[PDB]
Design an enzyme around this catalytic site. Structure first.
Site, short mmCIF file in Angstrom:
data_model
loop_
_atom_site.label_atom_id
_atom_site.label_comp_id
_atom_site.label_asym_id
_atom_site.label_seq_id
_atom_site.Cartn_x
_atom_site.Cartn_y
_atom_site.Cartn_z
N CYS A 162 0.77 -1.26 0.00
CA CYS A 162 0.00 0.00 0.00
C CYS A 162 0.80 1.31 0.00
O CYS A 162 0.23 2.36 -0.27
CB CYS A 162 -0.89 0.07 1.23
SG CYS A 162 -1.53 -1.51 1.74
N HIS A 302 -4.34 7.56 5.34
CA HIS A 302 -4.38 6.24 4.74
C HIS A 302 -5.82 5.71 4.78
O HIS A 302 -6.31 5.19 3.78
CB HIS A 302 -3.41 5.30 5.45
CG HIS A 302 -3.28 3.97 4.77
ND1 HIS A 302 -2.99 3.84 3.43
CD2 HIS A 302 -3.42 2.71 5.25
CE1 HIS A 302 -2.94 2.56 3.11
NE2 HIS A 302 -3.20 1.85 4.20
N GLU A 313 -4.55 5.09 13.11
CA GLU A 313 -3.97 6.22 12.35
C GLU A 313 -4.30 7.55 12.99
O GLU A 313 -3.45 8.45 13.07
CB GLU A 313 -4.42 6.20 10.91
CG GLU A 313 -3.91 7.41 10.14
CD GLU A 313 -4.14 7.33 8.66
OE1 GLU A 313 -5.00 6.55 8.21
OE2 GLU A 313 -3.45 8.09 7.92
N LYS A 335 -10.14 7.34 -0.03
CA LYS A 335 -10.54 5.94 -0.25
C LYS A 335 -12.02 5.71 0.00
O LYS A 335 -12.60 4.74 -0.50
CB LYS A 335 -9.72 5.00 0.63
CG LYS A 335 -8.23 5.06 0.33
CD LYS A 335 -7.52 3.97 1.09
CE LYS A 335 -6.07 3.85 0.68
NZ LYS A 335 -5.36 5.07 1.06
N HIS A 340 -9.27 1.49 -2.17
CA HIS A 340 -7.88 1.38 -1.84
C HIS A 340 -7.16 0.89 -3.05
O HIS A 340 -7.36 -0.23 -3.50
CB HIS A 340 -7.73 0.38 -0.68
CG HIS A 340 -6.34 0.26 -0.17
ND1 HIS A 340 -5.27 0.93 -0.72
CD2 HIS A 340 -5.83 -0.49 0.84
CE1 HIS A 340 -4.18 0.63 -0.05
NE2 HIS A 340 -4.50 -0.23 0.90
N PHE A 400 0.90 -3.23 4.33
CA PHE A 400 1.01 -4.54 4.95
C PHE A 400 2.47 -4.81 5.33
O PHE A 400 3.39 -4.41 4.63
CB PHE A 400 0.46 -5.64 4.04
CG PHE A 400 -0.86 -5.29 3.44
CD1 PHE A 400 -1.96 -5.04 4.27
CD2 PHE A 400 -1.02 -5.18 2.06
CE1 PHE A 400 -3.17 -4.69 3.71
CE2 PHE A 400 -2.23 -4.83 1.50
CZ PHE A 400 -3.31 -4.59 2.33
#
Lengths: 412, 413
Positions: A162, A302, A313, A335, A340, A400
């Site tokens: 990501c 994010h 976050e 997003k 995403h 990830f």
């Protein structure tokens, strides 16, 4: 100290096939999430995704060339060409060695990998395409764009799930700052909306399964969120040394002033409960830029719409920004609208962050009907926000394996 | 005053050994690691051999529980990473964790598990795909897993640039330490592409040697009878550290990273520039970075993959970048003659080899170089290792698919 600025941008997203159309849709709160129509999704837990609409490969290359490229590569090339044409950068014999490419993908060419494995199993090794490897591996957007446009400068591809698009932009800025290049074409691309892609993320229970209402599925920080929505696309920036850009009278969108990186070191897919990993990356980017929390007007988060991710976050943003910074900042996740975009997320979102500075407008987090308690920040729910005298804006990508990045851009 | 960057730990799995020390000894002895593939049926394959890691025991480096969620390329990268960290003695604590990061990648990633996932999809549908499909297969997961296992909270990156992967990671790790983002970094690459689809894909491109009768003679860089590369698996990792930080904790110091250069051929998807100029650009940039001239480079560990087009082009590039190669003051060799081409791990395994050449003042040979091409004009260290004297600098090159080129220069301490 060599300054780095943004001189060109290009994008294919679920909400538009240019930067301008995508930005307009985002400010209008428009979702790009649709039902998957290209394969039978009956047995799949998730049947929708943020798809690029009306892509024609023959517009950019011959069918003969395209047979040699998975769609992720075709997308990246299209955005890369857009960004180069947007910048007006002329490549000639004299400067070719000073202009390079930093472009990656999180997963690469799943569709052609699937097709190659099928051929292997059905008809044996001799029926696998001679272009199997170049058509699928993640560095081949950088490779093909370099070849197509004569770019002989540093040629790299960061692949950090990501965080991919963000890292490529950051390191492209670093390489220009360092003297390896005077310009770089940087970003990421992804086309993981394939049977195996949807199956793999599905098996991890990472995706929303709100099949009845695809456009409401992506709902960052909302109490009823149930995982991310996968999308496809490409986001590319042309970056350039400032004096080179200034010297040629370039239109300059923004300056890259801060880039920070960290690792959660917590878990394969879950983020640190305390949000400290994201905070480290933000803090490093702020030190790099020499700014404090109060100077950051907007964070393009994010915010993927996962139970554990979204909360963590915010904790990290509050730490990085401090009390005064937290009071005045805006935070949003686009997003909510695009889904995403994986390897393209970080670069698409960096373009969005730049446009927020250019237009002094911040896009919303749509679907934020019932936010979680105790967030304590302005998440720009539902509708866009006009801002005034916003000089710096930040974008975060947290991938990830705990790989975190933040960029800070300064208004120009 | 630049922040200087030094090598303080090394780790490796290769076809010729599962430690740096065993691998280095085998390389200096001219030993091949190429063997017949036994793990799948190769009857219909044009190439039936590869450089395989022998007797890999994942439990040596990690738990079986950790390893369950990983393709072999990740297991290999973790094993080398742990080796290198243990070799460095670097202690990670709450106070320094944010200053120690990872830069590790792979060229192709987890092909075996991708194959296994696609098979499951086609046979039994999406619900039979492993929950760990994505984390087990994508290329940034060596960095991710090692970070998690060892509490490394510094920058976390994975560069994936085909054959240049291991080198780019090491270089950028050095850049990040120099810049101030980290005080140490674990860096390199790993690959395990010796799978049915991997062998089939490279086979279909006619990229591999098909010398099935004599696998150990198949890899023969610059030899007239070369007929493509020999695929191998492995991992190479270095711990890099800021020089003052390294001294201050009492690090073992193998060498200093002094030059890193990059370029792109911009020529062709799989063929290198006929004139070798792309490789030269990368070398030249690395030499400028290090502030050295040709005369100061004692050894180049070449990309030299044993392909008709590639091997010749690289020599032209080396001669352009380094005058003194053509006068035989610069030794050049390809250890792919012994290991095969380790793809994403090639660049970092070979960086380690370049460092050891400076440490031991010994240069490993290009084996199988029975009948070299005419007109090369450089010392390719055929057949047997070479003792050297007062070698202060050594270089290693990787030139990958898509025209991506890199060069690193190390300095003896």
């Amino acid at each position: 100290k060599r300054r780095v600025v943004v001189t060109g941008m290009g994008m294919l997203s679920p909400v538009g096939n240019t930067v301008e159309s995508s930005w307009k849709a985002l400010l209008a709160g428009q979702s790009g999430i649709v039902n998957i129509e290209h394969f039978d999704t009956t047995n799949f837990s998730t049947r929708f995704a943020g798809l690029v609409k009306g892509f024609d490969c023959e517009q950019y290359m011959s069918k003969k060339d395209a047979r040699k490229m998975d769609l992720f590569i075709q997308y990246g090339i299209a955005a890369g060409i857009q960004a180069l044409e947007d910048s007006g950068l002329e490549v000639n014999e004299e400067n070719a060695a000073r202009i390079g490419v930093a472009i990656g993908s999180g997963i690469g060419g799943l569709e052609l990998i699937e097709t190659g494995h099928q051929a292997l199993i059905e008809k044996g090794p001799r029926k696998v395409s001679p272009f199997f490897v170049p058509s699928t591996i993640v560095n081949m957007i950088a490779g093909n764009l370099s070849i197509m446009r004569g770019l002989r400068g540093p040629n790299i591809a960061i692949s950090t799930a990501c965080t991919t698009g963000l890292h490529n932009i950051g390191h492209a800025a670093r390489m220009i700052a360092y003297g390896d290049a005077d310009a770089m074409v940087a970003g990421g691309a992804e086309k993981a909306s394939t049977p195996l892609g949807m199956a793999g993320f599905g098996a991890a229970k990472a995706l929303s399964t709100r099949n009845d209402e695809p456009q409401k599925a992506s709902r960052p920080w909302d109490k009823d969120r149930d995982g991310f929505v996968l999308g496809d696309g490409a986001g590319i920036m042309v970056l350039e040394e400032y004096e080179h850009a200034k010297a040629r009278g370039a239109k300059i969108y923004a300056e890259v002033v801060g880039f920070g990186m960290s690792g959660d070191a917590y878990h394969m897919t879950s983020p640190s409960e305390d949000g400290s990993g994201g905070a480290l990356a933000m803090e490093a980017a702020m030190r790099d830029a020499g700014v404090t929390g109060e100077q950051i007007g907007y964070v393009n988060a994010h915010g993927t719409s996962t139970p554990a991710g979204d909360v963590a976050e915010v904790k990290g943003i509050k730490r990085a920004l401090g009390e005064a910074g937290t009071k005045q900042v805006l935070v949003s996740s686009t997003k909510s609208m695009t889904g995403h975009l994986l390897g393209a997320a970080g670069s698409v979102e960096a373009i969005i962050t730049v446009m927020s500075l250019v237009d002094q407008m911040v896009p919303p987090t749509i679907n934020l009907d019932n936010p979680e308690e105790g967030l304590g920040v302005d998440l720009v729910p539902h509708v866009a926000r006009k801002v005034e005298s916003m000089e710096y804006a930040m974008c975060n990508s947290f991938g990830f394996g705990g790989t975190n990045g933040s960029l800070i851009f300064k208004r120009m």
